[PDB]
Design an enzyme around this catalytic site. Structure first.
Site, PDB file in Angstrom:
ATOM      1  N   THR A   1     -12.970   6.070   8.842  1.00 14.01           N
ATOM      2  CA  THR A   1     -14.030   6.542   9.718  1.00 14.01           C
ATOM      3  C   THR A   1     -14.805   7.691   9.794  1.00 14.01           C
ATOM      4  O   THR A   1     -15.655   7.993  10.443  1.00 14.01           O
ATOM      5  CB  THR A   1     -13.518   6.092  11.196  1.00 14.01           C
ATOM      6  N   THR A   2     -14.159   8.746   9.370  1.00 13.77           N
ATOM      7  CA  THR A   2     -14.524  10.001   9.345  1.00 13.77           C
ATOM      8  C   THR A   2     -15.404  10.021   8.151  1.00 13.77           C
ATOM      9  O   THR A   2     -16.746  10.512   8.255  1.00 13.77           O
ATOM     10  CB  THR A   2     -13.344  11.221   9.104  1.00 13.77           C
TER      11      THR A   2
ATOM     12  N   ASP B   1      -7.431  11.719  13.084  1.00 10.39           N
ATOM     13  CA  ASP B   1      -8.148  10.073  13.064  1.00 10.39           C
ATOM     14  C   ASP B   1      -9.492  10.303  13.792  1.00 10.39           C
ATOM     15  O   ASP B   1      -9.628  10.434  14.960  1.00 10.39           O
ATOM     16  CB  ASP B   1      -7.287   9.122  13.645  1.00 10.39           C
TER      17      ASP B   1
ATOM     18  N   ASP C   1      -2.523   4.016   9.678  1.00  6.00           N
ATOM     19  CA  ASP C   1      -3.735   4.140   8.546  1.00  6.00           C
ATOM     20  C   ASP C   1      -3.174   3.738   7.295  1.00  6.00           C
ATOM     21  O   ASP C   1      -4.049   3.163   6.365  1.00  6.00           O
ATOM     22  CB  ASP C   1      -3.955   5.503   8.574  1.00  6.00           C
TER      23      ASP C   1
HETATM   24  N1  LIG Z   1      -5.357  14.472  -3.056  1.00  8.12           N
HETATM   25  C1  LIG Z   1      -6.594  14.704  -2.758  1.00  8.12           C
HETATM   26  N2  LIG Z   1      -7.373  15.195  -3.630  1.00  8.12           N
HETATM   27  C2  LIG Z   1      -8.732  15.236  -3.450  1.00  8.12           C
HETATM   28  N3  LIG Z   1      -9.190  14.574  -2.319  1.00  8.12           N
HETATM   29  C3  LIG Z   1      -8.426  13.758  -1.533  1.00  8.12           C
HETATM   30  C4  LIG Z   1      -7.145  13.877  -1.567  1.00  8.12           C
HETATM   31  N4  LIG Z   1      -6.628  12.879  -0.969  1.00  8.12           N
HETATM   32  C5  LIG Z   1      -7.657  12.512  -0.120  1.00  8.12           C
HETATM   33  N5  LIG Z   1      -8.785  12.896  -0.477  1.00  8.12           N
HETATM   34  C6  LIG Z   1     -10.105  12.419  -0.027  1.00  8.12           C
HETATM   35  O1  LIG Z   1     -10.075  13.017   1.482  1.00  8.12           O
HETATM   36  C7  LIG Z   1     -10.954  11.729   1.997  1.00  8.12           C
HETATM   37  C8  LIG Z   1     -10.090  11.252   3.019  1.00  8.12           C
HETATM   38  O2  LIG Z   1     -10.114  12.351   4.069  1.00  8.12           O
HETATM   39  P1  LIG Z   1      -9.544  11.762   5.564  1.00  8.12           P
HETATM   40  O3  LIG Z   1      -9.667  12.792   6.549  1.00  8.12           O
HETATM   41  O4  LIG Z   1      -8.466  10.820   5.619  1.00  8.12           O
HETATM   42  O5  LIG Z   1     -11.045  10.649   5.847  1.00  8.12           O
HETATM   43  P2  LIG Z   1     -11.165   9.658   6.188  1.00  8.12           P
HETATM   44  O6  LIG Z   1     -11.260   9.286   7.816  1.00  8.12           O
HETATM   45  O7  LIG Z   1     -12.562   9.006   5.977  1.00  8.12           O
HETATM   46  O8  LIG Z   1     -10.032   8.580   5.445  1.00  8.12           O
HETATM   47  C9  LIG Z   1     -11.222  10.837   0.836  1.00  8.12           C
HETATM   48  O9  LIG Z   1     -12.554  11.113   0.315  1.00  8.12           O
HETATM   49  C10 LIG Z   1     -10.044  11.169  -0.235  1.00  8.12           C
HETATM   50  O10 LIG Z   1     -10.436  10.355  -1.208  1.00  8.12           O
HETATM   51 MG   LIG Z   2      -7.602   8.880   5.613  1.00  8.42          MG
END
Ligand SMILES: Nc1ncnc2c1ncn2[C@@H]1O[C@H](COP(=O)(O)OP(=O)(O)O)[C@@H](O)[C@H]1O
Ligand SMILES: [Mg+2]
Ligand SMILES: Nc1ncnc2c1ncn2[C@@H]1O[C@H](COP(=O)(O)OP(=O)(O)O)[C@@H](O)[C@H]1O
Ligand SMILES: Nc1ncnc2c1ncn2[C@@H]1O[C@H](COP(=O)(O)OP(=O)(O)O)[C@@H](O)[C@H]1O
Ligand SMILES: [Mg+2]
Ligand SMILES: [Mg+2]
Lengths: 503, 502, 502
Positions: free
Chosen positions: C76-77, C43, C372
């Site tokens: 947030t990331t 997170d 989340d």
């Molecule tokens: N199965 C997937 N294939 C490709 N991209 C994905 C997949 N699942 C999530 N993502 C992408 O990864 C990012 C989310 O990563 P994450 O570490 O949770 O970041 P954040 O804190 O912004 O939610 C998003 O841009 C999302 O669309």
């Molecule tokens: Mg996420």
């Protein structure tokens, strides 16, 4: 390392400082500085170059401003204070144009324009004259803020005379080789006792007591070598196998010195001036021969003497023929002060004279010498140039007035730059006044108007306590000095102005 | 990753230290070494060779400076500025996982194409050789503080090279060992002059030598005039008091005979690299020979070429065929000092420039600034062509590289385009330094060049994007090709180094 | 100049600390505070709120994290990664003398346009609410270590929100104070379950209280059960040895009467925020009352909403109308501990999630990961639309901004395009993190999107640029708009600060 603004303002600050260190020495009512080292010690002077060469400058930029005094001095003789003070003011005035946004370069171009222009106005308004009457005037003024006593008129006269006595004429123009004027000094209290010798004076005694106290109609031999026992370049050793020889060898030595003396006598020479040493046995026989000898004569002198008496400097006594002997009506030793000195008068060549400076203390003689040199140099220049300017802030006030007008007839940025140079020029009048203790601003205000009404020659009249007619007072600045001061200042001011990063 | 990040930055740092000196609104640098020696200049090679760089990458960037200086002579600040560009740009590409090999190839290819372009947009120097070359000389002087007198210095630079330039196969060749450049303080800049001959900053070795010799037979030695002591342990054994004088006479005779030899062969002047014994000095003097000593070797060579002399190191064998020739040799006082002027040289393709400056540090830059012109008018003359300056040609190469990029497409293309942006560094610097708005000028610059205005550069005075060849800002083609050459070779080297250890 | 250079870098630094955690090939961080407290998580808000940042710019970047977290909950990331992009890009523009005001306007305008685009390329959630929302819940779980059980956790996340979601004006509203989330170690992740009711991690205050009460009348106090000492200086004066017992009896009676009141009003359970006196404890116990104490205020509120109770702070006035209701309250051992489960709440729109993890630090992330999802399925539900993930929408916004740039031309345009390149940070990070070649994937990504493939993103598993909505990677529209919102507001702030002093 300093970049941009920091570097620049800092640099201007440095120059400004070194410049003020000498500011108070400017003009008649000038002051002196006392520099003290670690061994030699106390040096008290009013001379710009001196106060700075001796000064321990650390900041690079400051070292550059110092460079102009040394140049002004060795190149033109007078004006070392002026060139420094002026460089300080051009850098200072620029700092405003800088803050407003004007670029260092265009400022550098304004100063070019301005200086090139002033270099014409002065040459336009310069006043020609070569008569002793004014040569004397150049002198009196060159000796002003200096501690020379009340004798200035006397000193001025010695200088005019010495210059005139050595000034030669070639293809129409007059040349004055200042090298033909030998200045020396000797502690004996007087300043008035400063003798003008129509010949060459040598701070040396005759090597041996029995030698003639004086020599009339002298045949002078200048010698490069030392009248001493010489050894072969390839190491030698003497092997005595017979006791008898021990004496024979000791005699060769004697007979060696006898012959050296013989060669000398044979040439006709009766006076021997040796750049190197003389052996006591050589001395014995030179004295026995009645020849006036002097040892370890300074090469500088060996040269002037060669020129004054027409003698050829010979090393190998085998090439000591009558053809290479110099001439002087009299060669006489005379006691000047505590010291005995050798007077060579009536030299074959008249264009060689001396000024034996007297004065007491020591600290007073050195400076009086420094003052007499500025005088000698400028009187000489003026003799050649035949042109001069109105002293005491006059020339500057005029240049400033004209340059501020020329400024308008120039572009936007450059105008600003040339108006800046116009103001920088007013630094001299203001300074002369400040030192005199009068009111800078009003002096300037008054001086501007009078010069504006066409009174070229109205300078800062310390006597009238304000402004006045320099024409009357006879305060005249030699041309060559003004110009080198101006040109030197602009070149160095520009150099420093472009430096945007010092590392 | 990091080693690279660190290297690139260290490098870019050196670049920036020099950026502000580019062009007519260029600024100068003050450099004070440990010993307290001050060098106030604009010459980027000097600024670089001078500064105290430690980071190895920084040293490598400086390696650029000297090399650009070496081959061409003008453009070392340019080379550095580009090397920083290329590096700063690769810094971006590197973030996008573009492999440093790709970037190096792309940079290499762009570079090649860049030199081609310069050849293409270049212009053969026509019958306007004179004013063309003059315009070149001046643009050089424009960046330096010598601008003050660019008109006179440029004429001198033009005159000097034109003189020593041999037009062989319808092609010119300039040997600088025919252009003696001396600097003597105590005179204004405008006072700089051209002296037909080789001036040596040396006065006669003895007060009695003549101040002038007409129709001189110059004897050039690379040996000292002194008694020769054998190589074996030699010792004199005197058993008879009489021998002492016989030996001393013999030693004087040896020296008196050396002089006789030089004299016998008809020598009139004896210029030696080494020392002249005091007694030998007497003799030459007496013989009426004007002799100088401990002369600079570099000078020795110049006097040779000029007078058609031969540097004899075996006096005993000095032949008449070894004598140089000059119409007159004379000691002249150049301000404070006394210099020896060998005028009317046997070889008229030899000349001297006497740089005058009121102050030491002033005349020093003046001397550097002129050498830059000489190298320019010379390099131009030789090359035969020139390109429009003021960032025009850079903007041009930038323009053409963006196209070629689209042709040689791929990741290579990313590198080729960055190379273009980097070359654009020059117009940015030039603009910045004056005060012009980089992004605005750069945009207008691109426009004109897009529209085929291959010579539109930045007139740093008006702030307008005008015709550079028209307004006269032009430079030898050689300057541009190397800067891009040296610049890309640095970028590639720094770009392959992924680790720096001891 | 420098203050800015330094600020931008410090900022970008924080960004990078979080970059590697973006997406399904995201990595996690271990954070050990001064006290030795360890937080191992993914997170980004936590990674940020946790790390020890000092540089003020760095703190400002972290300010981003919390805010994005605050409003939306997921992303947030993402926000941080973009704020770094924008800043790193402005870093370039700043070199070309583009004024930070221009850059700020351009950034502002691009941002506005970016949110518009998201609205445009968005998709109303149709009748597929169930599987759509499930797909959303899962993508969230995909980045976290909870992926292991994304299928079960997502169903739970979907179930939980759907339950507490009130569909008012044909529009949904989710009050999280209706979703009690508890974490108890000692069970596998798969063991996480949904409990209809409000679980409280508290056991009964006395050994003698019943383990279960059916049809409970929950009395909720926000006052402790103890004798009330007056506000005035009160003292007991005993002059007769008999009074001593009379006083002690009176004090016990006061407590015995408090219990009587609560009992008389029909209370069956007494859950208090404060303490329960030991003697009062006896009484409740004896009365057969199940009573817990020193309960968490947050929990107090949740029990209120759930049971329709009222938090009485004046026991003397506890009315029957103040009683909550629940079908049954029971102490259950959740592994090691004993928890109190209030099941069959009066208000059925209240539910609990019991996160199970074998280890403390394990169950802690499990709890963060689920929250989340909840925030996602909830935010989605409320918004009503969703955008394609995997960098598709970013690549899209990037695409459309390059056009708008050409429209709102000028220097503004330079800023608008950089904003585009910056948004492209997401696809780069996503690719990088997996192992995909950023520059290659990014190029192919641009192609498809150019050709109007508004949903082509990076399938980080196959490495292909496929249809994101098809493969199911989708996210609530709300996540995207804020990230770009929070991100541009940081960039603009840091971008106007030209000096930082104390
Ligand atoms: N199965 C997937 N294939 C490709 N991209 C994905 C997949 N699942 C999530 N993502 C992408 O990864 C990012 C989310 O990563 P994450 O570490 O949770 O970041 P954040 O804190 O912004 O939610 C998003 O841009 C999302 O669309
Ligand atoms: Mg996420
Ligand atoms: N008698 C005088 N009256 C007015 N001004 C004088 C007088 N004498 C000298 N000055 C002025 O003082 C300035 C030079 O001062 P000085 O101490 O000699 O310094 P510098 O080293 O520059 O010659 C010149 O402007 C000069 O004309
Ligand atoms: N009059 C001018 N107007 C515009 N640009 C000029 C002018 N003169 C020179 N330049 C440009 O300035 C640069 C030369 O600056 P300079 O400091 O001498 O750098 P370098 O060390 O590379 O020769 C060149 O690109 C040149 O074309
Ligand atoms: Mg004076
Ligand atoms: Mg140049």
């Amino acid at each position: 390392r300093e970049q941009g603004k920091n570097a620049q303002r800092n640099n201007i600050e440095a120059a400004k400082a070194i410049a003020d260190a000498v500011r108070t020495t400017l003009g008649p009512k000038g002051m002196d500085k006392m520099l003290v080292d670690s061994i030699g010690d106390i040096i008290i002077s009013n001379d710009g170059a001196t106060i700075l060469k001796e000064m321990d400058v650390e900041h690079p930029t400051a070292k550059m401003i110092v460079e102009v005094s040394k140049a002004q001095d060795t190149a033109v003789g007078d004006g070392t204070t002026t060139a420094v003070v002026l460089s300080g003011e051009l850098l200072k005035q620029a700092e405003t144009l800088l803050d407003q946004g004007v670029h260092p370069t265009v400022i550098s171009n304004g100063y070019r324009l301005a200086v090139n222009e002033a270099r014409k106005i002065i040459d336009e308004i310069a006043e020609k004259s070569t008569d002793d009457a004014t040569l004397r005037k150049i002198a009196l003024t060159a000796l002003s803020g200096k501690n020379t006593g009340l004798s200035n008129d006397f000193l001025a006269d010695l200088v005019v005379k010495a210059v005139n006595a050595v000034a030669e004429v070639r293809d129409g123009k007059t040349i004055v080789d200042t090298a033909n004027i030998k200045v020396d000094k000797k502690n004996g209290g007087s300043v008035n006792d400063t003798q003008f010798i129509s010949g060459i004076v040598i701070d040396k005694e005759k090597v041996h007591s029995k030698m003639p106290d004086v020599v009339k109609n002298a045949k002078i031999a200048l010698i490069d070598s030392a009248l001493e026992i010489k050894k072969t370049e390839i190491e030698a050793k003497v092997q005595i196998s017979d006791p008898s020889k021990i004496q024979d060898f000791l005699n060769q030595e004697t007979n060696t010195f006898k012959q050296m003396v013989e060669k000398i006598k044979k040439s006709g020479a009766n006076v021997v001036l040796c750049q190197k040493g003389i052996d006591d046995v050589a001395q014995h026989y030179l004295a026995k021969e009645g020849i006036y000898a002097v040892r370890r004569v300074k090469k500088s002198d060996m040269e002037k003497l060669a020129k004054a008496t027409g003698a050829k400097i010979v090393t190998d006594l085998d090439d000591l023929t009558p053809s290479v002997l110099g001439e002087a009506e009299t060669v006489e030793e005379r006691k000047i002060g505590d010291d005995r000195m050798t007077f060579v008068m009536g030299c074959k060549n008249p264009k060689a004279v001396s000024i034996l400076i007297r004065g007491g203390t020591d600290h007073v003689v050195s400076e009086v010498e420094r003052a007499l040199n500025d005088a000698i140099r400028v009187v000489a220049i003026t003799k050649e140039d035949g042109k001069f300017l109105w002293g005491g802030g006059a020339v500057e006030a005029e240049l400033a007035m004209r340059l501020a007008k020329y400024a308008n007839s120039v572009g936007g940025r450059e105008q600003l730059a040339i108006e800046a140079f116009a103001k920088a020029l007013e630094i001299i009048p203001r300074t002369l006044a400040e030192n005199a203790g009068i009111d800078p601003i009003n002096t300037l205000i008054k001086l501007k108007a009078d010069d504006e009404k066409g009174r070229i020659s109205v300078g800062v009249d310390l006597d009238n306590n304000g402004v006045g007619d320099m024409k009357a007072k006879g305060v005249v600045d030699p041309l060559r000095v003004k110009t080198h001061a101006l040109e030197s200042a602009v070149e160095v001011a520009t150099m420093i102005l472009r430096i945007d990063d010092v590392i | 990753k990091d080693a690279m990040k660190e290297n690139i930055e260290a490098a870019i740092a050196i670049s920036n230290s020099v950026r502000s000196s580019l062009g007519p609104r260029g600024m100068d640098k003050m450099l004070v070494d440990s010993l307290g020696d001050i060098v106030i200049t604009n010459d980027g090679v000097t600024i670089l060779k001078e500064m105290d760089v430690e980071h190895p990458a920084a040293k490598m960037m400086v390696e650029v400076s000297k090399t650009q200086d070496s081959f061409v002579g003008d453009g070392t600040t340019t080379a550095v500025i580009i090397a920083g560009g290329l590096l700063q740009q690769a810094q971006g590409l590197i973030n996008q996982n573009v492999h440093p090999t790709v970037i190096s190839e792309g940079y290499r290819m762009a570079s090649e194409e860049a030199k081609r372009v310069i050849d293409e947009i270049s212009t053969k120097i026509g019958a306007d050789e004179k004013a063309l070359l003059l315009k070149m000389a001046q643009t050089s002087l424009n960046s330096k503080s010598a601008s003050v007198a660019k008109d006179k210095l440029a004429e001198i630079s033009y005159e000097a090279v034109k003189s020593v330039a041999e037009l062989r196969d319808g092609k010119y060749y300039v040997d600088f060992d025919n252009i003696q450049v001396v600097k003597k303080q105590g005179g204004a800049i405008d006072d700089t002059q051209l002296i037909n001959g080789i001036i040596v900053d040396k006065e006669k070795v003895h007060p009695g030598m003549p101040d002038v010799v007409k129709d001189a037979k110059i004897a050039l030695l690379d040996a000292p005039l002194e008694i020769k002591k054998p190589e074996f342990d030699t010792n004199l054994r005197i058993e008879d008091p009489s021998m002492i004088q016989k030996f001393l006479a013999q030693e004087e005779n040896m020296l008196r005979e050396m002089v006789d030899k030089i004299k016998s062969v008809g020598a009139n002047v004896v210029i030696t690299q080494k020392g002249i014994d005091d007694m030998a000095q007497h003799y030459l003097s007496r013989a009426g020979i004007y002799a100088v000593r401990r002369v600079k070797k570099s000078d020795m060579d110049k006097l040779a070429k000029a007078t058609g002399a031969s540097i004899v190191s075996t006096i005993d064998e000095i032949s008449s065929s070894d004598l140089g020739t000059a119409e007159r040799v004379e000691q002249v006082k150049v301000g404070e000092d006394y210099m020896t002027f060998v005028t009317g040289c046997k070889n008229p393709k030899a000349v001297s420039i006497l740089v005058r400056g009121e102050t030491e540090h002033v005349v020093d830059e003046m001397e550097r600034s002129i050498t830059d012109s000489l190298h320019v008018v010379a390099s131009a003359l030789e090359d035969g062509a020139y390109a429009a300056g003021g960032g025009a040609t850079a903007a041009e190469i930038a323009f053409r590289l963006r196209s070629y990029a689209q042709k040689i497409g791929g990741r290579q293309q990313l590198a080729i385009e960055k190379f273009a942006d980097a070359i654009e560094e020059i117009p940015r610097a030039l603009a910045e330094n004056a005060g012009l708005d980089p992004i605005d000028i750069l945009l207008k610059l691109r426009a004109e060049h897009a529209k085929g205005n291959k010579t539109y550069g930045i007139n740093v005075f008006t702030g307008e994007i005008e015709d550079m060849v028209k307004n006269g800002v032009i430079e030898p083609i050689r300057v541009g090709k190397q800067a891009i050459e040296s610049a890309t070779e640095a970028a590639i080297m720094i770009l392959r180094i992924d680790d720096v250890i001891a």
